[PDB]
Design an enzyme around this catalytic site. Structure first.
Site, PDB file in Angstrom:
ATOM      1  CG  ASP A 141      -5.776  -0.485   2.352  1.00  0.00           C
ATOM      2  OD1 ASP A 141      -5.717   0.121   3.444  1.00  0.00           O
ATOM      3  OD2 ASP A 141      -4.806  -0.571   1.570  1.00  0.00           O
ATOM      4  CG  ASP A 157      -2.023   1.045   1.118  1.00  0.00           C
ATOM      5  OD1 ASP A 157      -2.273   1.547   0.001  1.00  0.00           O
ATOM      6  OD2 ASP A 157      -2.635   1.363   2.159  1.00  0.00           O
ATOM      7  CB  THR A 170      -2.445   5.301  -0.398  1.00  0.00           C
ATOM      8  OG1 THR A 170      -2.223   3.886  -0.454  1.00  0.00           O
ATOM      9  CG2 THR A 170      -3.577   5.591   0.571  1.00  0.00           C
ATOM     10  CB  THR A 171      -0.532   2.776  -4.841  1.00  0.00           C
ATOM     11  OG1 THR A 171      -0.424   2.024  -3.627  1.00  0.00           O
ATOM     12  CG2 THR A 171       0.678   2.483  -5.714  1.00  0.00           C
TER      13      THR A 171
HETATM   14  N1  LIG Z   1      -9.269  -7.071 -11.904  1.00  0.00           N
HETATM   15  C1  LIG Z   1      -8.719  -5.886 -12.258  1.00  0.00           C
HETATM   16  N2  LIG Z   1      -8.642  -5.512 -13.552  1.00  0.00           N
HETATM   17  C2  LIG Z   1      -8.097  -4.339 -13.927  1.00  0.00           C
HETATM   18  N3  LIG Z   1      -7.591  -3.453 -13.051  1.00  0.00           N
HETATM   19  C3  LIG Z   1      -7.603  -3.699 -11.720  1.00  0.00           C
HETATM   20  C4  LIG Z   1      -8.178  -4.958 -11.238  1.00  0.00           C
HETATM   21  N4  LIG Z   1      -8.061  -4.946  -9.900  1.00  0.00           N
HETATM   22  C5  LIG Z   1      -7.459  -3.781  -9.547  1.00  0.00           C
HETATM   23  N5  LIG Z   1      -7.187  -3.038 -10.637  1.00  0.00           N
HETATM   24  C6  LIG Z   1      -6.532  -1.705 -10.641  1.00  0.00           C
HETATM   25  O1  LIG Z   1      -5.411  -1.689  -9.752  1.00  0.00           O
HETATM   26  C7  LIG Z   1      -5.324  -0.419  -9.101  1.00  0.00           C
HETATM   27  C8  LIG Z   1      -4.831  -0.587  -7.666  1.00  0.00           C
HETATM   28  O2  LIG Z   1      -4.743   0.681  -7.023  1.00  0.00           O
HETATM   29  P1  LIG Z   1      -4.224   0.771  -5.506  1.00  0.00           P
HETATM   30  O3  LIG Z   1      -2.717   0.686  -5.516  1.00  0.00           O
HETATM   31  O4  LIG Z   1      -5.024  -0.207  -4.681  1.00  0.00           O
HETATM   32  O5  LIG Z   1      -4.647   2.257  -5.065  1.00  0.00           O
HETATM   33  P2  LIG Z   1      -4.419   2.748  -3.548  1.00  0.00           P
HETATM   34  O6  LIG Z   1      -2.918   2.766  -3.394  1.00  0.00           O
HETATM   35  O7  LIG Z   1      -5.071   4.110  -3.495  1.00  0.00           O
HETATM   36  O8  LIG Z   1      -5.112   1.693  -2.719  1.00  0.00           O
HETATM   37  C9  LIG Z   1      -6.706   0.211  -9.176  1.00  0.00           C
HETATM   38  O9  LIG Z   1      -6.619   1.574  -9.600  1.00  0.00           O
HETATM   39  C10 LIG Z   1      -7.486  -0.620 -10.177  1.00  0.00           C
HETATM   40  O10 LIG Z   1      -7.919   0.180 -11.282  1.00  0.00           O
END
Ligand SMILES: Nc1ncnc2c1ncn2[C@@H]1O[C@H](COP(=O)(O)OP(=O)(O)O)[C@@H](O)[C@H]1O
Ligand SMILES: Nc1ncnc2c1ncn2[C@@H]1O[C@H](COP(=O)(O)OP(=O)(O)O)[C@@H](O)[C@H]1O
Ligand SMILES: Nc1ncnc2c1ncn2[C@@H]1O[C@H](COP(=O)(O)OP(=O)(O)O)[C@@H](O)[C@H]1O
Ligand SMILES: [Mg+2]
Ligand SMILES: [Mg+2]
Ligand SMILES: [Mg+2]
Lengths: 49, 535, 31, 523, 523
Positions: free
Chosen positions: B399, B68, B101-102
């Protein structure tokens, strides 16, 4: 990223203000020796001359 | 010249000006972009379900593997004031929403990279910052087009599970992708107040113990504390517990002031023995008169009071924490009683299977509460193979507990996987020509930076960024724009509505809002007054 | 299908940006 | 981040030295304890630089990794992995360290093959699911017919003690480990088996005591042995009580009243002992210290007094005599007393210990370990602790699998059968999972000095067509049946070797950036 | 030897860190130049810490290893191996470094298999003997029908220049390299092809001169161009002779005799020039310096005078004009003169050079390399030197093999066919020899970004049943025929890649003790 020179770099209005103070450092010396009311100076060396 | 005047006098303005650093120039804005792009290029590889984790080592030598974006930037020793604002940006996303957050750091580094080529063309940095506000406003209004949810918290938990699978899909809990997703859904709905739409995370206790596996993580409706039965012959299983919660130690009553009690004769010393002998028989009988068969005490026990528990068949624990007994009175429906004289049958708690479970060869013996009656406090017991997989699962499931909280605050959703970023990039490009007066180049730099987040998902999935993004973006213009993104195994078609990639509206609404305002505070700065050495 | 996946876990993807950023400082010095 | 570094004293690496330092630091941990795996593997001797070095020889992989103090960041994951394996099942800490290192060694072979690291994670999750069904379908249960379950328990202790210092003592130490858990007759508390280490004598002179041993010998003028006694223990204060009223003084007007108070204090201490002897006892055990004034009262009444045994010493006496703690003496009809036959004192290694011979309801044991040096006694205590913890869980989970390399070839066969029903993207990662499972009988075969290139090849040819019980015979150096030789291990031990190594290799393979912070007081 | 060390400042290691440092130091050399192998591999830039660093970009593996200065003892064997490959055939220095490193990488895999290292040496000697028969039976000779041999020579220069900086210049630089060796018409002296590097212009502006270029322009008052001239060169002293009598002075009695001696000195220097112009020449080249007194004599007679060209410059003029050195002028009927058409001066890069246009018997060339920077000119000179040396040996040995990965799969097939006809002791070492030969098409396929796991697997299935000319097509990224595409290499270049890598890996694998002495001035 920046320039990888091993010296020193200064841009902008820093050198544009330093050259005027470099020229005014010489002019403020010789301003006291101009005209019939000008006065002489003393130039003392490290050896004593 | 510096440190000298033209008349020969020393020219000292500020103290220790020889060991200072000042940059106004044209590279002061360039030094902010190159310091922020290296943070965004680090967090680019940890985005999406194919995002690789990072190994963080603390100052004490402790190693924590985090994925994260909140914990990665927080555990750095970066002494750079531009990159320190990226740490507080990922911290502000965790405190408000807690899912992107990422993505909020890669987006902020993308807006500054597109502003670097705009800076060389002669555009003022505030004019780029004023152009990003007119461009981010289009991304907010376009994100509220398709948004609907049918959550009723009774039987339609299917949109709630698929929302938590998007958050847990990028973490290391993909082995428990269906099991642990249903834990975080039921943990929120049992503690949330639906009349006020407020969720309190103090009622959700997240505990962890090494041993077992990731599949042994269960949602314990109740509380899990460290059981400290003072008697080793205490019964380790209570079928129907009338829990008597008290906050008074099993001792003769000691006042809070200085007493210095005087003993004069031997009749007063024999009165001391009968005072304490009747006090330990009074504190034990007042619990048994209420019908209780279990006692919780915050403070310690006396040795004389320990054997009186076994004679009256009254198990009791010792030295429970502050907020731990606050969770017992809500899970059992009892009341915390200050004294022993105020005990009654109405202030007792109700619980079912009260037992301690030993884990392997250790001596912890945590409490397991199986049965309850309308509890408003749950406890998640995370197990694993090592402490690296447990402390990450405490951060991964937190999260997942936050994205269910955001659905109660706002019941509108979007479709992730890069589908919302491509659709928002087309809205800025359509309004860049209405009108291209001054901020035409600033809006096109915003739309080119919104495409960095879906093209980072194509890079981590082994695909090509410019090949995959051109195919998805062209399909949204030739017809009406669907939930069209990408994935790792791609699940056949690229429809995010069929792949059930569901993200919250206010999660991505705060990703564009916080990254734009953090860019405005690092574009509207033309000087650095940092010192030199430490001493 | 994805028609393959080419994992490139090596050094010179980052050194290629070092030659770009160094040549940009030379062009901006005599700009 | 290396280019234009914005850190003070901290360094980092991304995808170049991150997986390089992770694969070097994890293989060197697994190659360290590689020589301690198997029934013919050698042992290590651990030493410090000085300042009470306290050398401690151990063969178990958890005790080696918990004392070395590795500076590598990725190597601490495998150190913490073996710590949980010792705390959960107590065995396989060396087997889970080599298996987690052989997975990352096969993952280092996939560096030059340009395989994506997320494909190896998805390939190993399907490989671990196929390996769980191989151990679950081959587990042998034992319900009734207890004469076959006690024979099965001796095969568990015979397999665990064969890889330790107790090599040529399987005729004695197997009976000391099986009968210790068999006398528990309940939950595996793993603290009623008090192990006492005494110097002098060989390991064959060690024995399991039929009663219980203790220290802090019986008083000054008290009897040393009482036949057919009633044991009452306690956890109460005897003398200098200062009873629970903080802020109470003796404020008198003359010194003659102080002599009346201190006589009244000794009368209440005498009346407390008079409440104890109303139960009709002959022995007394107090967790706290017994001073001189109640010690004279027990000696005049012919009652023993064992003062300050241990905090956990009264718990073992309550499980070996069948009484209760009884810290308050005001109801003699509600206090259950213990039972014994002889409380004579025995001398083991020029030290008089209190032997509780002939106790009733004895759910506690005392292992008297005798060795040549202190280094042997510290190794034999950890070797017996690695054997009693498995038998305490074998009585809770009676499922057993055939060890000695037979379980690893069953797990590697189920992965290879499903590696051929997969496309070529994930099939290469599944073949590397099956090759690492075959390394675990290869380390055992090569530690004895056998031909490891041919014996594992004979095991792979045997398990490919039948032979579900075929394993490695370390006695003669051939391939034999594991059900005939009696080399079995527990199901929960072999599951935790497979499951924890697959989860720990998942964490290190997913690391692409190692950002270590600046340490304190290191210049 | 570590225990009770009898050394002062020297250290050593035996069988534990000896082969450990030998396998780490040799793989890190091979993995360094791994990214420079193939027609899609990148290049390196070599830099020092300062003090006239003199950055020199090179893609050839010999120039990289000869300037890095490796501190590892076993890595200097592979550094010296690439130096001999550049001195013998001038190509394959990168291919012999990765192949010798992939042999020791497979030998590191035989550490844990407990294979004896002398079994790997005896297993590789039988493997290298079978690999010589694969290249010898597949060599294509070219005798008569010279219109197919000149097409075959352009395939050699097209394959060598494809792995260098001259990527999109194969339409020009192939004709500059084939016709340079074709104008030699004899022995490959590799010094008549004088490469002149001048800044300004692109690499497409470079050309092969039809005549010859030189420096040290024609006198002061001498003609600059003479049509239909007779070139006579020399290697004699012109002025200030001091003729070969050490210890000879002019001891006279008056200063009038010194004026007669110095007039007699200038008369003998004038008579020497008069013996030169009796041949009927128009140009004069002296290896030594020409002073002012014979310069006026050549200018008065209308004769050119080129003073102090080079020590090897008069050798190239003797091969391009068809004359002799002629250091003594006393027989005009025994001195052969050169022949030319135009001796005009041309200006290349603001520098006037002497162009010998229209020379007879021109067995010498001049390549005028023009590039954007000096780093390109230093790279294109070494790229042309690696192309002219192979064509100088292809005209001496007309045997050619099909390159582009086709030759390595033929060599790996002959080892694999004899690996199944051997007992199991040496068969495992021969299988590792065949896997290292298949790494050389794997490095070429993975440098472009193709699927190296499938293309080498298709090459192994193609060569297993026929298809002796099937190789790797780097243009489209598939498998094609090497005889149709025209990707061939010389037989002696591919033999020295196979033979020198097998001999160098034999030395490092046989090392069990590295005893390094105490260095000087290192503290
Ligand atoms: N099954 C999936 N297919 C396509 N994209 C995905 C899938 N699962 C997650 N994602 C993408 O991966 C990203 C993960 O973001 P993340 O690092 O969790 O954000 P944060 O750091 O704010 O929690 C999301 O923006 C999402 O669009
Ligand atoms: N009699 C035997 N025959 C064959 N193999 C055996 C025998 N006894 C022990 N082994 C093997 O030796 C290994 C010892 O592993 P061990 O180091 O005890 O693991 P851990 O450190 O996790 O307890 C076991 O995996 C077992 O298969
Ligand atoms: N057109 C082509 N098609 C296929 N392979 C080629 C082509 N051109 C060059 N190669 C390969 O590239 C490799 C380059 O090797 P090189 O680095 O020149 O070796 P060395 O350093 O010993 O000269 C050769 O082994 C050759 O097989
Ligand atoms: Mg997430
Ligand atoms: Mg064991
Ligand atoms: Mg070549």
């Amino acid at each position: 990223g920046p320039l990888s020179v091993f010296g020193d770099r200064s841009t902008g209005e820093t050198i544009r203000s330093q050259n005027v103070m470099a020229a005014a450092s010489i002019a403020n010396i010789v301003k006291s020796s101009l005209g019939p009311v000008g006065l002489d100076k003393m130039l003392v060396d490290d050896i004593g001359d | 010249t510096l440190a000298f005047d033209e008349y020969g006098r020393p020219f000292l303005i500020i103290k220790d000006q020889d060991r200072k650093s000042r940059l106004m120039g044209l590279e002061a804005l360039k030094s902010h972009i190159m310091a922020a792009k290296a943070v965004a290029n680090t967090m680019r590889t940890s985005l999406g379900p194919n995002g690789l984790d990072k190994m963080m080592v603390d100052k004490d030598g402790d190693v924590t593997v985090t994925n994260d974006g909140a914990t990665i930037l927080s555990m750095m020793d970066v002494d750079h004031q531009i990159a320190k604002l990226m740490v507080e940006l990922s911290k502000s996303q965790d405190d408000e929403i807690g899912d992107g957050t990422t993505g909020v750091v890669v987006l902020a580094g993308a807006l500054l990279e597109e502003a670097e080529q705009l800076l060389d063309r002669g555009i003022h940095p505030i004019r780029i910052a004023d152009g990003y506000e007119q461009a981010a406003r289009v991304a907010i209004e376009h994100l509220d087009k398709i948004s609907d949810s049918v959550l009723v918290d009774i039987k339609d938990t299917e949109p709630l599970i698929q929302t938590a699978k998007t958050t847990l899909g990028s973490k290391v809990v993909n082995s428990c992708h269906r099991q642990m997703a249903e834990i975080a859904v039921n943990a929120v709905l049992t503690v949330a107040d639906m009349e006020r739409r407020d969720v309190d995370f103090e009622l959700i206790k997240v505990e962890g113990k090494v041993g077992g596996r990731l599949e042994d993580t269960k949602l314990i409706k109740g509380v899990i504390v460290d059981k400290d039965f003072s008697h080793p012959q205490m019964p380790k299983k209570v079928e129907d517990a009338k829990i008597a919660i008290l906050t008074c130690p099993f001792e003769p009553p000691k006042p809070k002031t200085k007493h210095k009690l005087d003993v004069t004769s031997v009749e007063d010393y024999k009165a001391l023995q009968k005072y304490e002998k009747e006090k330990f028989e009074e504190m034990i009988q007042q619990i048994k008169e209420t019908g209780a068969n279990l006692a919780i005490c915050q403070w310690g026990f006396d040795d004389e009071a320990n054997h009186l528990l076994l004679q009256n068949n009254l198990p009791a624990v010792r030295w429970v924490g502050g907020p731990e007994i606050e969770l017992i009175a809500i899970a059992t429906g009892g009341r915390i009683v200050p004294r022993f004289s105020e005990l009654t049958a109405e202030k007792l708690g109700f619980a079912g299977l009260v037992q301690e479970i030993s884990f392997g060869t250790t001596k912890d013996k945590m409490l397991v509460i199986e049965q309850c009656k309308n509890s408003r406090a749950v406890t998640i017991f995370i197990r694993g193979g090592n402490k690296m997989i447990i402390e990450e699962a405490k951060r991964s499931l937190h999260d997942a507990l936050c994205v269910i909280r955001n659905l109660i605050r706002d019941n509108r959703v979007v479709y992730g996987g890069g589908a919302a970023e491509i659709s928002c990039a087309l809205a800025v490009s359509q309004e860049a020509d209405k009108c291209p007066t001054l901020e035409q180049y600033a809006m096109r730099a915003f739309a080119d930076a919104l495409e960095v987040i879906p093209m980072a998902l194509s890079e981590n999935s082994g695909m090509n960024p410019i090949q995959t993004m051109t195919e998805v973006r062209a399909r949204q213009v030739k017809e009406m724009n669907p939930a069209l993104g990408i994935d790792c195994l791609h699940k056949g078609t690229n429809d995010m509505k069929q792949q059930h990639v569901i993200e919250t509206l206010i999660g991505k609404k705060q990703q564009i809002s916080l990254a734009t305002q953090m860019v405005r505070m690092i574009l509207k700065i033309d000087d650095i007054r940092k010192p030199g050495e430490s001493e | 299908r994805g028609k393959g996946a080419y994992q490139d876990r090596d050094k010179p993807a980052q050194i290629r940006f070092s030659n770009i950023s160094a040549a940009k400082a030379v062009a901006d010095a005599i700009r | 981040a290396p280019v234009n570094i914005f850190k003070a004293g901290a360094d980092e690496e991304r995808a170049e030295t991150a997986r390089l330092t992770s694969f070097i630091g994890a293989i060197a941990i697994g190659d360290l304890v590689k020589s301690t795996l198997g029934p013919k593997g050698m042992d290590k001797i651990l030493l410090s630089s000085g300042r009470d070095a306290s050398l401690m020889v151990t063969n178990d992989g958890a005790t080696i990794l918990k004392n070395i103090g590795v500076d590598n960041p990725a190597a601490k994951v495998l150190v913490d992995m073996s710590r949980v394996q010792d705390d959960e099942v107590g065995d396989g800490t060396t087997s889970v360290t080599v298996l987690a290192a052989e997975l990352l060694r096969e993952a280092e072979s996939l560096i030059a093959k340009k395989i994506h690291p997320q494909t190896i994670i998805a390939g190993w999750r399907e490989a671990t699911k196929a390996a769980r069904e191989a151990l679950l379908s081959s587990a042998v249960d034992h319900g009734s017919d207890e004469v076959k379950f006690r024979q099965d328990l001796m095969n568990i202790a015979g397999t665990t003690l064969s890889s330790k210092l107790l090599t040529h003592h399987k005729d004695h130490f197997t009976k000391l480990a099986v009968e210790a858990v068999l006398r528990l007759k309940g939950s595996g508390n793993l603290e009623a088996i008090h192990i006492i280490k005494k110097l002098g004598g060989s390991l064959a002179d060690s024995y399991l005591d039929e009663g219980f041993l203790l220290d802090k010998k019986i008083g000054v003028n008290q009897p040393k042995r009482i036949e057919n006694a009633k044991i009452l223990i306690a956890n109460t204060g005897m003398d200098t009580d200062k009873i629970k009223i903080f802020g109470s003084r003796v404020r008198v007007d003359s010194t003659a009243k102080v002599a009346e108070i201190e006589h009244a204090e000794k009368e209440k201490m005498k009346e407390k002992v008079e409440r104890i002897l109303k139960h009709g006892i002959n022995c007394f055990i107090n967790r706290q210290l017994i001073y001189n004034y109640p010690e004279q009262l027990f000696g005049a009444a012919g009652v023993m007094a064992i003062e300050h045994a241990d905090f956990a010493g009264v718990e073992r006496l309550a499980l070996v005599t069948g009484g209760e703690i009884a810290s308050t003496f005001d109801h003699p009809e509600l206090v259950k007393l213990g039972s014994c036959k002889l409380i004579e004192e025995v001398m083991i290694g020029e030290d008089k210990l209190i032997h509780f011979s002939g106790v009733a309801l004895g759910e506690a044991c005392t292992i008297v370990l005798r060795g040549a040096t202190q280094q042997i006694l510290d190794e034999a205590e950890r070797s017996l602790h690695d054997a009693l913890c498995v038998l305490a869980q074998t009585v809770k989970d009676s499922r057993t699998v055939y060890g000695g390399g037979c379980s690893e070839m069953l797990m590697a066969h189920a992965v290879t059968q499903l590696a051929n029903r997969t496309p070529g993207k994930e099939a290469v990662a599944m073949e590397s999972y099956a090759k690492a499972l075959r390394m675990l009988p290869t380390i055992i075969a090569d530690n004895a000095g056998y031909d490891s290139a041919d014996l594992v090849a004979q095991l792979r040819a045997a398990h490919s067509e039948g032979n579900t019980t075929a394993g490695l015979d370390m006695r003669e150096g051939t391939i034999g049946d594991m059900a005939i030789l009696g080399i079995t291990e527990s199901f929960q031990v072999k599951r935790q070797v497979l499951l924890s190594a697959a989860e720990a290799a998942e964490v290190i393979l997913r690391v692409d950036n190692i950002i270590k912070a600046a340490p304190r007081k290191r210049v």
